[PDB]
Design a protein around this motif. Structure first.
Motif, short mmCIF file in Angstrom:
data_model
loop_
_atom_site.label_atom_id
_atom_site.label_comp_id
_atom_site.label_asym_id
_atom_site.label_seq_id
_atom_site.Cartn_x
_atom_site.Cartn_y
_atom_site.Cartn_z
N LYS A 26 0.86 -1.22 0.00
CA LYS A 26 0.00 0.00 0.00
C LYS A 26 0.88 1.25 0.00
CE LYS A 26 -4.06 -2.13 2.18
NZ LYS A 26 -5.30 -1.84 2.94
N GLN A 27 2.15 1.14 0.40
CA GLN A 27 3.04 2.33 0.53
C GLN A 27 4.43 2.06 -0.05
OE1 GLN A 27 2.22 2.60 4.84
NE2 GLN A 27 1.83 4.76 4.42
N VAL A 28 5.09 3.15 -0.47
CA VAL A 28 6.49 3.17 -1.01
C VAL A 28 7.33 4.11 -0.15
CG1 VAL A 28 5.88 4.93 -2.76
CG2 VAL A 28 7.98 3.61 -3.00
N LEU A 29 8.58 3.71 0.11
CA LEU A 29 9.55 4.50 0.90
C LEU A 29 10.17 5.56 -0.01
CD1 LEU A 29 10.70 4.58 3.78
CD2 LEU A 29 12.69 3.34 2.90
N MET A 30 10.10 6.82 0.40
CA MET A 30 10.75 7.93 -0.34
C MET A 30 11.75 8.63 0.57
SD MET A 30 7.66 9.37 -2.65
CE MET A 30 8.89 9.86 -3.85
N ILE A 31 12.75 9.27 -0.04
CA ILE A 31 13.83 10.05 0.65
C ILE A 31 13.89 11.44 0.02
CG2 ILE A 31 15.21 8.06 1.34
CD1 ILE A 31 17.01 8.85 -1.21
N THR A 32 14.36 12.44 0.77
CA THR A 32 14.65 13.79 0.24
C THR A 32 15.97 13.76 -0.53
OG1 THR A 32 15.51 14.38 2.40
CG2 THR A 32 13.25 15.07 1.90
N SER A 33 16.04 14.50 -1.65
CA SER A 33 17.23 14.62 -2.55
C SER A 33 18.39 15.26 -1.79
CB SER A 33 16.90 15.41 -3.79
OG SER A 33 18.07 15.67 -4.56
N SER A 34 19.63 14.87 -2.13
CA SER A 34 20.89 15.42 -1.56
C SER A 34 21.18 16.80 -2.17
CB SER A 34 22.05 14.47 -1.77
OG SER A 34 22.22 14.14 -3.14
N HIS A 36 18.70 18.77 -4.01
CA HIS A 36 17.47 19.60 -3.88
C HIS A 36 16.66 19.14 -2.66
CE1 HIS A 36 18.32 18.35 -8.17
NE2 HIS A 36 18.78 19.61 -8.17
N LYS A 37 17.05 19.60 -1.46
CA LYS A 37 16.59 19.10 -0.14
C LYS A 37 15.05 19.16 0.02
CE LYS A 37 17.48 23.62 2.09
NZ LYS A 37 18.06 24.27 0.90
N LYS A 38 14.34 19.80 -0.91
CA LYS A 38 12.85 19.95 -0.87
C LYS A 38 12.15 18.80 -1.61
CE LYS A 38 13.16 24.05 1.12
NZ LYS A 38 12.72 24.26 2.52
N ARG A 39 12.87 18.09 -2.49
CA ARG A 39 12.27 17.10 -3.43
C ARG A 39 12.30 15.69 -2.81
NH1 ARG A 39 10.05 21.36 -5.92
NH2 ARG A 39 11.27 22.12 -7.70
N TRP A 40 11.16 14.98 -2.86
CA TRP A 40 11.00 13.57 -2.41
C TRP A 40 11.24 12.64 -3.61
CZ3 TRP A 40 10.60 11.87 2.55
CH2 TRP A 40 10.26 12.79 3.54
N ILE A 41 12.28 11.81 -3.54
CA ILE A 41 12.67 10.85 -4.61
C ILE A 41 12.77 9.46 -3.97
CG2 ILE A 41 13.83 12.51 -6.10
CD1 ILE A 41 16.51 11.51 -4.79
N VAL A 42 13.27 8.48 -4.72
CA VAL A 42 13.46 7.09 -4.20
C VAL A 42 14.95 6.79 -4.13
CG1 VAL A 42 11.20 6.26 -4.98
CG2 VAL A 42 13.18 6.12 -6.52
N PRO A 43 15.37 5.81 -3.30
CA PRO A 43 16.79 5.47 -3.17
C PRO A 43 17.37 4.92 -4.48
CG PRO A 43 15.49 4.43 -1.40
CD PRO A 43 14.52 4.99 -2.43
N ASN A 117 12.98 -4.32 7.18
CA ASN A 117 13.29 -3.46 8.35
C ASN A 117 13.71 -2.05 7.93
OD1 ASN A 117 13.36 -3.05 11.12
ND2 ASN A 117 15.38 -3.98 11.40
N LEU A 118 13.38 -1.07 8.78
CA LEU A 118 13.77 0.36 8.67
C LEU A 118 14.59 0.67 9.94
CD1 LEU A 118 10.53 2.08 7.33
CD2 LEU A 118 12.53 1.23 6.09
N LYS A 131 10.36 8.65 4.41
CA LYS A 131 8.94 8.49 4.82
C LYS A 131 8.20 7.57 3.85
CE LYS A 131 5.09 11.47 6.36
NZ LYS A 131 4.00 10.48 6.20
N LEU A 132 7.24 6.79 4.37
CA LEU A 132 6.31 5.96 3.56
C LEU A 132 5.20 6.85 3.00
CD1 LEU A 132 6.04 2.77 5.81
CD2 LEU A 132 7.34 3.05 3.70
N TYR A 133 4.80 6.60 1.75
CA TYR A 133 3.72 7.34 1.05
C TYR A 133 2.84 6.36 0.29
CZ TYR A 133 6.13 11.81 1.95
OH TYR A 133 6.71 12.89 2.55
N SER A 134 1.52 6.58 0.31
CA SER A 134 0.56 5.87 -0.58
C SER A 134 0.90 6.22 -2.03
CB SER A 134 -0.86 6.22 -0.25
OG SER A 134 -1.20 7.48 -0.80
N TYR A 135 0.34 5.49 -3.00
CA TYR A 135 0.63 5.70 -4.44
C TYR A 135 0.35 7.16 -4.83
CZ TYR A 135 0.34 5.60 -9.50
OH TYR A 135 0.52 5.87 -10.82
N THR A 136 -0.85 7.67 -4.53
CA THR A 136 -1.30 9.03 -4.97
C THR A 136 -0.31 10.08 -4.45
OG1 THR A 136 -3.53 8.18 -4.88
CG2 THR A 136 -3.32 10.55 -5.20
N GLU A 137 0.09 9.99 -3.18
CA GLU A 137 1.04 10.93 -2.55
C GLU A 137 2.41 10.82 -3.23
OE1 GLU A 137 -0.67 10.86 2.01
OE2 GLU A 137 0.74 9.26 1.46
#
Ligand SMILES: O=P(O)(O)CP(=O)(O)O[C@@H]1[C@@H](OP(=O)(O)O)[C@H](OP(=O)(O)CP(=O)(O)O)[C@H](OP(=O)(O)O)[C@H](OP(=O)(O)O)[C@H]1OP(=O)(O)O
Ligand SMILES: [Mg+2]
Length: 163
Positions: A26-34, A36-43, A117-118, A131-137
Protein backbone atom coordinates in the motif's frame (compact mmCIF):
# COMPACT_ATOMS: atom_id res chain seq x y z
CA UNK A 1 34.67 9.89 -7.74
CA UNK A 2 35.85 8.03 -10.92
CA UNK A 3 34.44 4.73 -9.49
CA UNK A 4 31.26 5.59 -11.52
CA UNK A 5 30.29 3.31 -14.53
CA UNK A 6 28.87 4.74 -17.84
CA UNK A 7 26.97 3.17 -20.80
CA UNK A 8 29.61 2.29 -23.46
CA UNK A 9 26.94 3.26 -26.11
CA UNK A 10 25.19 6.47 -24.86
CA UNK A 11 27.78 7.59 -22.23
CA UNK A 12 24.80 7.76 -19.78
CA UNK A 13 25.72 7.29 -16.06
CA UNK A 14 24.62 3.78 -14.91
CA UNK A 15 22.45 4.10 -11.74
CA UNK A 16 20.56 1.41 -9.76
CA UNK A 17 17.84 1.83 -7.13
CA UNK A 18 14.82 0.33 -5.37
CA UNK A 19 11.07 0.89 -5.26
CA UNK A 20 10.80 -0.17 -1.57
CA UNK A 21 7.22 -1.37 -0.77
CA UNK A 22 5.46 -2.37 2.49
CA UNK A 23 4.51 -6.10 2.68
CA UNK A 24 0.82 -5.07 2.10
CA UNK A 25 2.15 -3.07 -0.97
CA UNK A 26 0.00 0.00 0.00
CA UNK A 27 3.04 2.33 0.53
CA UNK A 28 6.49 3.17 -1.01
CA UNK A 29 9.55 4.50 0.90
CA UNK A 30 10.75 7.93 -0.34
CA UNK A 31 13.83 10.05 0.65
CA UNK A 32 14.65 13.79 0.24
CA UNK A 33 17.23 14.62 -2.55
CA UNK A 34 20.89 15.42 -1.56
CA UNK A 35 21.09 18.24 -4.22
CA UNK A 36 17.47 19.60 -3.88
CA UNK A 37 16.59 19.10 -0.14
CA UNK A 38 12.85 19.95 -0.87
CA UNK A 39 12.27 17.10 -3.43
CA UNK A 40 11.00 13.57 -2.41
CA UNK A 41 12.67 10.85 -4.61
CA UNK A 42 13.46 7.09 -4.20
CA UNK A 43 16.79 5.47 -3.17
CA UNK A 44 19.22 5.11 -6.14
CA UNK A 45 22.88 5.79 -7.03
CA UNK A 46 25.83 5.32 -9.40
CA UNK A 47 27.08 1.74 -9.97
CA UNK A 48 30.79 1.47 -8.94
CA UNK A 49 33.49 -0.46 -10.95
CA UNK A 50 33.81 -3.29 -8.32
CA UNK A 51 30.02 -4.10 -8.09
CA UNK A 52 29.15 -7.39 -9.89
CA UNK A 53 25.42 -6.65 -10.61
CA UNK A 54 22.78 -3.87 -10.45
CA UNK A 55 21.04 -5.56 -7.42
CA UNK A 56 24.28 -4.97 -5.35
CA UNK A 57 24.17 -1.19 -6.16
CA UNK A 58 20.37 -0.99 -5.54
CA UNK A 59 20.58 -2.63 -2.05
CA UNK A 60 23.77 -0.66 -1.17
CA UNK A 61 22.01 2.66 -2.10
CA UNK A 62 18.73 1.62 -0.32
CA UNK A 63 20.79 1.05 2.89
CA UNK A 64 23.06 4.18 2.51
CA UNK A 65 20.27 6.67 1.62
CA UNK A 66 17.14 5.24 3.40
CA UNK A 67 18.43 2.84 6.13
CA UNK A 68 16.18 0.23 4.43
CA UNK A 69 16.76 -3.58 4.37
CA UNK A 70 14.61 -5.99 2.35
CA UNK A 71 14.46 -8.65 -0.37
CA UNK A 72 14.33 -7.88 -4.14
CA UNK A 73 10.99 -9.38 -5.37
CA UNK A 74 11.03 -8.02 -9.01
CA UNK A 75 13.25 -6.56 -11.78
CA UNK A 76 11.39 -3.33 -12.85
CA UNK A 77 13.81 -2.94 -15.80
CA UNK A 78 15.27 0.37 -17.02
CA UNK A 79 14.21 4.04 -17.29
CA UNK A 80 16.29 7.03 -18.53
CA UNK A 81 16.77 10.59 -17.21
CA UNK A 82 15.92 12.44 -20.49
CA UNK A 83 16.51 15.97 -18.97
CA UNK A 84 18.39 18.25 -21.44
CA UNK A 85 21.87 19.70 -20.64
CA UNK A 86 20.19 27.77 -26.54
CA UNK A 87 20.40 27.34 -30.41
CA UNK A 88 17.24 25.28 -31.34
CA UNK A 89 15.76 23.62 -28.21
CA UNK A 90 12.75 21.96 -30.01
CA UNK A 91 12.19 19.84 -33.20
CA UNK A 92 8.43 20.20 -34.07
CA UNK A 93 6.55 17.54 -36.13
CA UNK A 94 3.26 18.43 -37.99
CA UNK A 95 0.89 16.99 -35.26
CA UNK A 96 3.37 16.92 -32.29
CA UNK A 97 6.47 18.65 -30.73
CA UNK A 98 9.61 17.28 -28.96
CA UNK A 99 12.81 18.48 -27.21
CA UNK A 100 15.93 18.48 -29.51
CA UNK A 101 17.81 15.09 -29.84
CA UNK A 102 20.28 14.34 -26.96
CA UNK A 103 21.70 11.21 -25.22
CA UNK A 104 20.21 10.20 -21.83
CA UNK A 105 21.93 11.72 -18.77
CA UNK A 106 21.32 8.55 -16.68
CA UNK A 107 20.21 4.94 -17.34
CA UNK A 108 18.40 3.68 -14.17
CA UNK A 109 18.08 -0.06 -13.33
CA UNK A 110 15.20 -0.38 -10.79
CA UNK A 111 14.24 -3.30 -8.50
CA UNK A 112 11.11 -3.72 -6.36
CA UNK A 113 12.04 -4.50 -2.73
CA UNK A 114 9.75 -5.79 0.06
CA UNK A 115 10.76 -3.79 3.19
CA UNK A 116 11.89 -6.19 5.99
CA UNK A 117 13.29 -3.46 8.35
CA UNK A 118 13.77 0.36 8.67
CA UNK A 119 16.76 1.35 10.93
CA UNK A 120 17.11 4.70 12.83
CA UNK A 121 20.90 5.00 12.14
CA UNK A 122 22.26 4.72 8.54
CA UNK A 123 25.05 6.53 6.63
CA UNK A 124 22.92 9.51 5.36
CA UNK A 125 20.33 9.59 8.26
CA UNK A 126 21.52 13.18 9.17
CA UNK A 127 21.58 14.44 5.49
CA UNK A 128 18.10 13.15 4.36
CA UNK A 129 14.50 12.56 5.52
CA UNK A 130 12.73 9.24 4.67
CA UNK A 131 8.94 8.49 4.82
CA UNK A 132 6.31 5.96 3.56
CA UNK A 133 3.72 7.34 1.05
CA UNK A 134 0.56 5.87 -0.58
CA UNK A 135 0.63 5.70 -4.44
CA UNK A 136 -1.30 9.03 -4.97
CA UNK A 137 1.04 10.93 -2.55
CA UNK A 138 4.20 9.30 -4.07
CA UNK A 139 2.96 10.09 -7.65
CA UNK A 140 2.46 13.80 -6.71
CA UNK A 141 5.93 13.89 -4.96
CA UNK A 142 7.75 12.61 -8.12
CA UNK A 143 5.83 15.11 -10.36
CA UNK A 144 6.67 17.89 -7.80
CA UNK A 145 10.33 16.60 -7.95
CA UNK A 146 10.18 16.81 -11.85
CA UNK A 147 11.21 13.10 -12.16
CA UNK A 148 8.77 11.33 -14.53
CA UNK A 149 11.34 8.45 -15.05
CA UNK A 150 11.15 7.71 -11.25
CA UNK A 151 7.29 7.66 -11.52
CA UNK A 152 7.57 5.22 -14.52
CA UNK A 153 9.64 2.90 -12.26
CA UNK A 154 7.00 3.26 -9.46
CA UNK A 155 4.18 2.49 -12.00
CA UNK A 156 5.91 -0.84 -13.00
CA UNK A 157 5.97 -1.95 -9.29
CA UNK A 158 3.18 -3.97 -7.55
CA UNK A 159 2.18 -0.85 -5.45
CA UNK A 160 -1.65 -0.77 -4.96
CA UNK A 161 -2.79 2.23 -7.08
CA UNK A 162 -6.50 1.94 -6.13
CA UNK A 163 -6.49 4.42 -3.17
O1 LIG B 1 28.55 18.02 -8.61
P1 LIG B 1 27.86 18.02 -9.95
O2 LIG B 1 27.03 19.27 -10.14
O3 LIG B 1 28.84 17.83 -11.07
C1 LIG B 1 26.70 16.64 -10.03
P2 LIG B 1 25.39 16.66 -8.78
O4 LIG B 1 26.07 16.61 -7.38
O5 LIG B 1 24.56 17.88 -9.01
O6 LIG B 1 24.60 15.30 -9.03
C2 LIG B 1 23.76 14.72 -7.97
C3 LIG B 1 24.49 13.53 -7.37
O7 LIG B 1 25.65 14.04 -6.66
P3 LIG B 1 27.14 13.54 -6.99
O8 LIG B 1 26.99 12.52 -8.12
O9 LIG B 1 27.69 12.92 -5.72
O10 LIG B 1 27.92 14.76 -7.43
C4 LIG B 1 23.62 12.80 -6.37
O11 LIG B 1 24.32 11.60 -5.92
P4 LIG B 1 24.23 11.19 -4.41
O12 LIG B 1 22.90 10.59 -4.05
O13 LIG B 1 24.66 12.40 -3.53
C5 LIG B 1 25.54 9.94 -4.25
P5 LIG B 1 25.31 8.50 -5.30
O14 LIG B 1 25.80 8.86 -6.67
O15 LIG B 1 23.83 8.21 -5.28
O16 LIG B 1 26.10 7.36 -4.69
C6 LIG B 1 22.30 12.39 -6.99
O17 LIG B 1 22.59 11.50 -8.12
P6 LIG B 1 22.26 9.91 -8.15
O18 LIG B 1 23.60 9.21 -8.11
O19 LIG B 1 21.41 9.60 -6.93
O20 LIG B 1 21.51 9.65 -9.45
C7 LIG B 1 21.58 13.62 -7.52
O21 LIG B 1 20.33 13.21 -8.13
P7 LIG B 1 18.93 13.58 -7.43
O22 LIG B 1 19.20 13.67 -5.93
O23 LIG B 1 18.48 14.91 -8.00
O24 LIG B 1 17.99 12.44 -7.78
C8 LIG B 1 22.42 14.32 -8.56
O25 LIG B 1 21.72 15.53 -8.97
P8 LIG B 1 21.05 15.75 -10.42
O26 LIG B 1 22.18 15.58 -11.42
O27 LIG B 1 19.97 14.70 -10.58
O28 LIG B 1 20.49 17.16 -10.41
MG1 LIG C 1 21.69 8.74 -5.03
Amino acid sequence: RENQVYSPVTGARLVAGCICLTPDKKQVLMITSSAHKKRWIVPKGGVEKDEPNYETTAQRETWEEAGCIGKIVANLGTVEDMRPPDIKQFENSRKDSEVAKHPPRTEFHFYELEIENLLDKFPECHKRHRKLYSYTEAKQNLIDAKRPELLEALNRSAIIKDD
